[PDB]
DNA sequence: GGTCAGAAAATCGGTTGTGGTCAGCTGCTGCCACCGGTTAACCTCCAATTCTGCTGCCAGCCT
């Protein structure tokens, strides 16, 4: 929203701004790769009726991505209790 | 002890007249079918035989 209409060159400030932008996505990817086992453990109980196993796991992956989008830390709860709703 | 206007038939066709009649939407109004988002104690790794060709493998003369 700033570079849409305004141009500035602080070199160190722009470098650390891009550093924040990169490492936020690094953090998000690390969180998803941490909770993949939760996704698999939830999806292992729906097998045998209708769909395959890995389709269920990838749908749980989409639900986990949405839960990471919707997560809030100010209420102060364990992440798995919030993410189980979106995965299911 | 014969010719000419009128009357009386269907006949082909235009008027017409209204009497419904059916649909063609047209709101419209309620409703109902369908799609999307959301839920905050915790609990984080699966259910037989026959034949031909190919590749992987190990000793072993040769340099």
The string of DSSP letters for chain A reads: --TTT-----HHHHHHHHHHHHHHHHHHHHHHHHHHHHHHHHHTTSTTSSS-SHHHHHHHHHHHHHHHHH--SSS---HHHHHHHHH-
Residues with CB under 7 A from strand B: A 34-38, 40-41, 44, 47, 53, 66, 70-72, 75, 77-82, 84-86, 88
Nucleotides of B under 7 A from a protein CB: 38-47
SS3 A64: helix
């Amino acid at each position: 929203e700033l570079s849409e209409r305004g141009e500035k060159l602080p070199a160190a400030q722009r470098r650390d701004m891009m550093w924040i932008c990169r490492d936020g996505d690094r953090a998000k990817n690390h969180l998803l790769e941490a909770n993949l086992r939760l996704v698999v453990s939830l999806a292992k109980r729906y097998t045998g009726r209708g769909m395959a196993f890995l389709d269920l796991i990838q749908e749980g992956n989409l639900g986990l991505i949405r839960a990471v989008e919707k997560f809030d830390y100010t209420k102060g709860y364990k992440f798995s209790t919030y993410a189980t709703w979106w995965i299911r």
